């Protein structure tokens, strides 16, 4: 029911800015304040601030009161967070989150208020001097199961999503973590293990998505001529 | 500040307690919430108002307040899918909020060996003046492995980039390694090999320009 | 726009005495079972928090400011079977109409 749907990943030059966003559905948007929480990679969660959608009231943590500006639009039920003067340290997952009420676990408890009950999916914003570089996608053709896959090569920054057959194929699928390779770019693999009997009789398509470069790729994966 | 132990551990079946200690005041002055975050995912509520489970949260998770320690604590029984980060939270006044985080490590889980697949370069990549060998290693436990490459019978170390193991949602670990080549390097040998070793044993996988 | 709420119940400010010591508006204090009341904001272990009684009718409207919101809420309260003493809070943008203390 309740959904907080965040914007896509980005990359930004130092000194630049970002305006991240978060759509809400499934609750009365103006009943609960929307919060923002950051997560530097390998580091913990850290509350940024909040906005109360029924008016313009916003609040911030001592760290972020200088550069950040959180707003809410109740015509679209979308909350936005703007962050100026970006720095190398700001490379993080940014989450929107909201409180929600529940009738408690027991008859005696009553209607409770639960902090950060729902979270958005998160958006990875990378801050770097280096420019965006989109993925080159190549098929890993199969030579009683056969393995076939897609190589998602030389892209920057993270992240990359890979599905198969538009999400209809999930059994035997394994997408691997990317190698951060010496040059600074990323390379990633997804493979799906498959009955070799099906190679002439099922089309396998990997769907690659690199939101930082707005790149989307469909690659059919076929066995070669023998 | 809220300070948490950056790491905590526990075996299957056992019960594990994670601390959350306040530096600035009494844990009896604000409610303490707790959250779980599985790798590669958004956080989820597990506890609020010190010891209340949200809708859908199992009885295995319990919150606690020890005013003598000035430490809140989250105690998780029946350890398992419970492998994740765990965070405490509490407010600061009418408007501000403070998070703690603890990486909960589940140890003694059953061992498992890797399945390995090695790919030659695609014809499309060769037409692009490049060649990459993809060595894929998956479903092993514990999360530590060693990978090596050989051009014909002779080892090669330049041109290799290898990942650190990490957990798939199926609880075993996975990794990938890449040998980057020129099409002339690839074509000029008779075979290339990826060799993987996990627990005192080694699998060899090989490919050829044929 | 600013969204305003009209409530046909009292707002309560409550602190711990299970049982909570609550006041309504000036300030009248009384003790309530925690089961009878509904949080209007995050609950506070130290100080008081704003609550609602379980039985409550509410409506909302967007307006340039509270003065225009009162036009519509006075109309709503006439068209429906609603009466009482009025009150406005700017922190929550909530009007309250109650026929208490009678
Ligand atoms: C409730 O709050 C009032 C505020 O003055 C206080 O006098 C009283 O002792 C508190 N407790 C009870 C049970 O009324």
Numbering used by the authors:
A (entry chain A): 1 to 52, 52A, 53 to 82, 82A, 82B, 82C, 83 to 100, 100A, ...
B (entry chain B): 3 to 9, 11 to 27, 27A, 27B, 28 to 66, 66A, 66B, 67 to 79, ...
C (entry chain C): 118 to 134, 153 to 160, 170 to 186, 186A, 186B, 186C, 186D, 187 to 242
What's written in the study?
Crystals of D15.SD7, D19.PA8 and VD20.5A4 with the scaffolded 16055 V1V2-1FD6 were obtained and diffracted X-rays to resolution of 2.8 Å, 2.0 Å, and 2.8 Å, respectively. The V1V2 structure adopts the same conformation as seen in the 16055 NFL trimer (RMSD of 0.9 Å, 0.6 Å, and 0.8 Å over 44, 39, and 41 Cα atoms, respectively), confirming that these antibodies recognize an epitope elicited by the trimer and that likely no induced-fit conformational changes were induced by the antibodies binding to the scaffolded V1V2 compared to the trimer. Our structural analysis indicated that there are two copies in the asymmetric unit of D15.SD7/1FD6-V1V2 and D19.PA8/1FD6-V1V2 structures. We observed clear density for three glycans in the gp120 V1V2 region at N156, N160 and N187 in one complex of D15.SD7/1FD6-V1V2, while the other complex in the asymmetric unit showed density for the N156 glycan only and thus chose the former for further analysis. Of note, D15.SD7 heavy chain showed some interactions with the 1FD6 scaffold, which we did not include in our analysis since they are not biologically relevant. Finally, both heavy and light chains are similarly involved in the interactions, except for D15.SD7 and VD20.5A4 which use primarily the heavy chain (57% and 78% of the total BSA of the paratope, respectively), with the CDRH3 accounting for 56% and 50% of the total BSA of the paratope and 98% and 64% of the heavy chain BSA, respectively. The CDRH3 length varies from 11 to 20 residues but no correlation with potency was observed although D15.SD7 used primarily its 20-amino-acid CDRH3 to interact with its epitope. D15.SD7 and D19.PA8 form 10 and 7 HBs with their epitope, all of which interact with the hypervariable V2 region. Moreover, D15.SD7 and D19.PA8 form 10 SBs with their epitope, all of them with the hypervariable V2 region. The conserved N-linked glycosylation site at residue N187 in the variable V2 region makes minimal contacts with the light chains of D15.SD7 and D19.PA8, since there is electron density for the first proximal NAG in some molecules of the asymmetric unit.
Here, we analyzed monoclonal antibodies (mAbs) isolated from non-human primates (NHPs) immunized with variants of a native flexibly linked (NFL) HIV-1 Env stabilized trimer derived from the tier 2 clade C 16055 strain. Structural characterization using negative-stain EM and X-ray crystallography identified the variable region 2 (V2) of the 16055 NFL trimer to be the common epitope for these antibodies. The crystal structures revealed that the V2 segment adopts a β-hairpin motif identical to that observed in the 16055 NFL crystal structure. These results depict how vaccine-induced antibodies derived from different clonal lineages penetrate through the glycan shield to recognize a hypervariable region within V2 (residues 184–186) that is unique to the 16055 strain.
